[PDB]
Curated annotation (Swiss-Prot), chain A:
It is found in: Cell inner membrane. The chain crosses the membrane at residues 7-30, 37-56, 65-88, 109-129, 183-204. This is Multidrug export protein EmrB. Belongs to the major facilitator superfamily. EmrB family. Part of the tripartite efflux system EmrAB-TolC, which is composed of an inner membrane transporter, EmrB, a periplasmic membrane fusion protein, EmrA, and an outer membrane component, TolC. The complex forms a large protein conduit and can translocate molecules across both the inner and outer membranes. Interacts with EmrA. EmrAB complex forms a dimer in vitro. It comes from Escherichia coli (strain K12). The chain holds residues 300 to 503 of 512 of the full protein.
Curated annotation (Swiss-Prot), chain B:
The chain holds residues 202 to 251 of 390 of the full protein. The lineage of its organism: Bacteria, Pseudomonadati, Pseudomonadota, Gammaproteobacteria, Enterobacterales. It is found in: Cell inner membrane. This is Multidrug export protein EmrA. Homodimer and homotrimer. Part of the tripartite efflux system EmrAB-TolC, which is composed of an inner membrane transporter, EmrB, a periplasmic membrane fusion protein, EmrA, and an outer membrane component, TolC. The complex forms a large protein conduit and can translocate molecules across both the inner and outer membranes. Interacts with EmrB. EmrAB complex forms a dimer in vitro. Belongs to the membrane fusion protein (MFP) (TC 8.A.1) family. Part of the tripartite efflux system EmrAB-TolC, which confers resistance to antibiotics such as CCCP, FCCP, 2,4-dinitrophenol and nalidixic acid. EmrA is a drug-binding protein that provides a physical link between EmrB and TolC. It comes from Escherichia coli (strain K12). It comes from the Bacteria.
Length: 204, 50
């Protein structure tokens, strides 16, 4: 039931960390093996997503979805600068334009692909959970006729009560499916960790 | 009066609930001591023929 402005406000705490650490990382870049920053960022991204996975609940306040982004601030802060420094390492000054164009093209393609996969997974797993849930709502079940009795107490018809129960099942399925995606993303991160070590150190 | 006797006798003979179909029991929401009306589901019988 959030609004657009409130929903956007829940992602403010991501920028608290980078807006500070970005210069410090830039200032001290002379004495860091940037690969170790990339590895730390991947571990920090896995931590944040597992954090979201085991803590999302129907009655979670604004703070329950604001601490994880505060943590993700570190992960985002130490991922762009080092990896982009590695990406454009050793190339002559004249070609920096073409390399940047290629990098941006690949990154945008990746973003589009990620959105396309995630949305479909979310909806389909919501459907699966809906199927597995609506089974329990049948006759021959206490604490199922009681719900109908309480609903009819408020004046709702039988059909309206059925619709209300269906809506609740849908919401629960969305939360479960949404948390199943976060778990998968963190797991996938755990494997992408070590690839950054294949890059030679000509950085400069 | 014979008609009323017949109605009462049918009422008494119906205190034993008989299965109308051959099949298998699936759900059981009836326990000893439950208060039952003609609108309360009790069991289900699922044949395996057709």
């Amino acid at each position: 039931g959030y609004t657009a402005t409130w929903a956007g406000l829940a992602s403010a705490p991501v920028g608290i960390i980078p807006v500070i650490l970005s210069p410090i990382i830039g200032r001290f870049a002379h004495k860091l093996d940037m690969r170790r920053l990339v590895t730390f960022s991947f571990i920090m991204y896995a931590v944040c997503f597992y954090w979201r996975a085991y803590t999302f609940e129907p009655g979670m306040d604004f703070g329950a979805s604001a601490w994880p982004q505060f943590i993700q601030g570190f992960a985002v802060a130490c991922f762009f600068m080092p990896l982009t420094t590695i990406t454009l390492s050793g190339l002559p000054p004249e070609r920096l334009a073409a390399a940047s164009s290629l990098s941006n093209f690949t990154r945008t393609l990746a973003g589009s692909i990620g959105t396309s996969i995630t949305t479909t997974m979310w909806t389909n797993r919501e459907s699966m959970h809906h199927a597995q849930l609506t089974e329990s709502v049948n006759p021959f079940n206490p604490n199922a006729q009681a719900m109908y009795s309480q609903l009819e107490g408020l004046g709702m018809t039988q059909q309206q009560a059925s619709g209300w129960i269906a809506q609740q099942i849908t919401n629960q399925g969305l939360i479960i499916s949404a948390n199943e995606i976060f778990w998968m993303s963190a797991g996938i991160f755990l494997v992408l960790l070590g690839l950054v070590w294949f890059a030679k150190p000509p950085f400069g | 009066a014979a008609t009323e006797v017949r109605n009462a006798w049918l009422a008494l003979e119906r205190t034993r609930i008989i299965s109308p179909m051959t099949g298998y029991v699936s759900r059981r929401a009836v326990q000893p001591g439950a208060q039952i009306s003609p609108t309360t589901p009790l069991m289900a019988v699922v044949p395996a023929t057709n």
